Amino acid sequence: NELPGTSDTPLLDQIHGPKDLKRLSREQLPALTEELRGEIVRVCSRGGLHLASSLGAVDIITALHYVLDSPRDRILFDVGHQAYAHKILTGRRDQMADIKKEGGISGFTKVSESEHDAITVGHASTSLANALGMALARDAQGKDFHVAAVIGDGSLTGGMALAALNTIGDMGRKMLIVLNDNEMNPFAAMGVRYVGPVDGHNVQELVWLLERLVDLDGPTILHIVTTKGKGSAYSWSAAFGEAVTEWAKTDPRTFVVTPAMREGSGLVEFSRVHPHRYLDVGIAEEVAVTTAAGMALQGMRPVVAIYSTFLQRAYDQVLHDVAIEHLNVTFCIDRAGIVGADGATHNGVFDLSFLRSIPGVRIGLPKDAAELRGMLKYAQTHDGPFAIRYPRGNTAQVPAGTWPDLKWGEWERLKGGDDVVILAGGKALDYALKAAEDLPGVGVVNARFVKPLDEEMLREVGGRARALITVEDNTVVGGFGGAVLEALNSMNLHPTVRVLGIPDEFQEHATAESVHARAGIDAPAIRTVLAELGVDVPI
Amino acid sequence: SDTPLLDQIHGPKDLKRLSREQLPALTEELRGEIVRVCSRGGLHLASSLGAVDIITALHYVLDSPRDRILFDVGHQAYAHKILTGRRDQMADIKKEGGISGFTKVSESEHDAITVGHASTSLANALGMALARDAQGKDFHVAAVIGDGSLTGGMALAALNTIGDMGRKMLIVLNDNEMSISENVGAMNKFMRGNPFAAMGVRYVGPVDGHNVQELVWLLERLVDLDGPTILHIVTTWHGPAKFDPATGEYVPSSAYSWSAAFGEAVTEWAKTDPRTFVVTPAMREGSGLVEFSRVHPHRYLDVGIAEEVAVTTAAGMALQGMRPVVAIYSTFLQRAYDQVLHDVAIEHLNVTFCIDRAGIVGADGATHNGVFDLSFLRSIPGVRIGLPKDAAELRGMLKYAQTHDGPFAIRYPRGNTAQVPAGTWPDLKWGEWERLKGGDDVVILAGGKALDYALKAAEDLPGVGVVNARFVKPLDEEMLREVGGRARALITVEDNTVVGGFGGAVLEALNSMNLHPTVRVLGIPDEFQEHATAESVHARAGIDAPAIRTVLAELGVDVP
């Protein structure tokens, strides 16, 4: 029990779980609220994080955990970036300094981290459907516990949230939805008792109101209003932002669509220079891709700027709405491969697998900003869809007016050697060049095209090499290694091949470097495979 | 002639020569035309008959193809094709080399979008409106969307974006689920709890969707107005062999659809497993769940046409200790890719996917061919994939999936399989293949529909082995190693794309074992397959028994 001061927390020191929180009287909850605010700011500041959303949520989370009995009652957080107060109140206060770090805890709720985490989230708008499943399962088991979902105003505009709300209406089952609105319809929300708006920062009035709502029949939306945040490095994103901004100046058919990730995708400058050629469709990736398809049908050259992990939401839209009529949609896919800190919900290691199987979708991996420019120019000037994927990370700035002629599907040899040849693009290529550096028999090819592959160069290298190594910042299942084995098979070439990539296992929050070392795709791990294939490494 | 007005109409220009007072007679001609020419090929006419009046009205008022008319799904657009120069092609609808059952951009300048999957019209319409405004043009964009499609995730999300952008366009909501009075009453209840004004959309109606003259007068007022507008309209044998309409030839009378085999299995299973719960995205009859829904009413959930909701709802049930089954077509499962990966697979949840219409479905074409699931499911960590040869293996796989940890997918085609007795619950080790025919010269690896081709192809060829590759994830590593070491050549056959499918799984597995047999990967090529019979598509793809026999002959097997 330390002295009163600027950063004492007498109440939190006694709270190890929600049961300890219930020992407080309602009148004490405003003081806890301020302790939680102080705790979040003083620990979760460095690295930015989703501090602003968690701060906005402190009072509704305190009230929910005071009124409800987690883990018997299920509190579901949409996305989960707003649940830092939830983790402090559920035995993880001492782990907040390590949030998103290897050996720490997730930046989102994760079922396997705590019995208090009802869903594993990261992708937005899943809380309502999960909530429905838990309510239906509860009713089937004759149990009586409460299901409460906390969803932001942004998340509630997602297709699967609105579709789920409609169903929650039709089903008429007991559940509470807290709409957490920090910005201040009849086809989605019929059958749903609406309550509010109400002050989202009044922890006593929220405890009062929840004790009323929690026991009512059928589904309730509680509309709360919250204040957001109450209390050398040249990125691939920037390289893209600069290339497309430059491109649009001399292509009036170019239109850039983002699903509400303008700053992430590096389109701040693009939004200000070309406001007439910029569309933020909101959070819905499915709307972004089908809208781009409508634009391409009317003679435009749309570019969808989207994270690899988020493009998963639009798989059927790419296949059905773009690929069937071979439409002019270019996909500039950021956060390609392991993103690291954000963990298994955000690691973009599936795009080379799910896009490859779609007829007519070309796939490029640029090694640098000049190749990115070459691919974007090709994509925007040739028929049908193209995907260009690049990681979170940096690359050399490139001079204005850099627009090389790149023949799509052509690989390039970057290092001499015929005994063993490493085939790799993007981040994997930099690993390959490093791994090969002192080995004269070890060739390196920039496999900068996954679809189509360079069949001629693969035939030449496949016919002479004692062994090939494939390296990809993607799952080894049906990805770049699979494409290479399928192309070798159809040529009836049978060289030794080592397929290096992410294993068929979800990768938890850590640095990309850690995931890459344990996956065995980094330069040291490639150097180990070369030795295993009988390459004489220098002493 | 029974159709004197229609006889002079070869396009929307001809339609506009009629006085409004002649339009009612024209809608009666169009209804009689659709019944006269499309009463076969198991075509459902209800949707297209219900839409005759609005489609006549839209073509009379708008200027197609300058004005863009977008049909959601496209199954309601028969009158559209009749009014846009395709009257004499309607006899060949869904037939190989005939017109599509849906609108298709390549078929006609009057078909604004290629559709089949629901709920895509609004986002496509937004795109066309935004391109129109960028180009300084002023043509009309109209989307026609059913009440069912409108409650789809991408439709509800699109309408939010449409409201925010405030761009000029007309959404026609074709509601055949509720009357005008039922709709008004529901809306009165809700806003007592304009509501569309905050969303940024003008709501007009509901009005009578069968009054072609009143629809014309109302549209003429709406097409001028700024911003997005919703017009809510309201519309109305005991012998040993039997002919199967679906497959277009004779089958044993003991043969029923895979759908019926699944419905019978899950209905029986749920009697002794109280944790089993079936979830369908509004395909009760298609997935064979009529009987299930009647016998187990409190273990049956229809979520409407929201595949993403069906999968994530099942995840919630699994997290609460239940054993949910998602009954879903392969093609519609594509909508739930992220939900399978993110909501089911990351925490390895107890969701069983029973996937109907797996492989080529035929008549419904490129938008419906379930030819990608062995590729897209396989790259998801922890998702097991089984291909049952018969109703017994389907039961063994469903029992395995419902009693073991994590997600399982069971995929089966449109088509028939032998009826099997109640209480058929074999014990099957997930991941174990079965040798069905001896031979070590050339071995065919195949599951499900491909397996039937393989066994037919290998008849009276003594050196040709056949393995039931009834598991795609995991593969049978032990049996593939043995066959891959001993066989001169392998043939893989899959009712799936050759890209990243079963053939790919086999080549990945052989590579990690450092085995180098000759392998012929047979399957659907990396190209969309247009409407035709499955048998026609399979013959041209090279996966039927004669195509397999030709590959065996090329590999130097003695084939009669």
Ligand SMILES: Cc1ncc(C[n+]2csc(CCOP(=O)(O)OP(=O)(O)O)c2C)c(N)n1
């Ligand atoms: C499928 C998906 N697409 C995009 C994102 C990126 N994203 C993370 S937070 C968020 C939600 C928008 O804000 P809101 O739900 O209102 O939450 P707030 O931060 O305002 O509390 C978005 C777009 C995501 N998590 N999931």
Ligand SMILES: Cc1ncc(C[n+]2csc(CCOP(=O)(O)OP(=O)(O)O)c2C)c(N)n1
């Ligand atoms: C994405 C998708 N999921 C499922 C289906 C299957 N399906 C075909 S039409 C339909 C019903 C659509 O209802 P509505 O739009 O009201 O049209 P109506 O049946 O009344 O003509 C369904 C579920 C589909 N076509 N697309």
Ligand SMILES: [Ca+2]
């Ligand atoms: Ca689609």
Ligand SMILES: [Ca+2]
């Ligand atoms: Ca193009």
Ligand SMILES: [Ca+2]
């Ligand atoms: Ca290069």
Ligand SMILES: [Ca+2]
């Ligand atoms: Ca050689």
Ligand SMILES: [Ca+2]
């Ligand atoms: Ca309709």
Ligand SMILES: [Ca+2]
């Ligand atoms: Ca299971």
Ligand SMILES: [Mg+2]
């Ligand atoms: Mg103090």
Ligand SMILES: [Mg+2]
């Ligand atoms: Mg918000």
Ligand SMILES: [Mg+2]
């Ligand atoms: Mg893991």
Ligand SMILES: [Mg+2]
């Ligand atoms: Mg309907």
Ligand SMILES: [Mg+2]
């Ligand atoms: Mg084709």
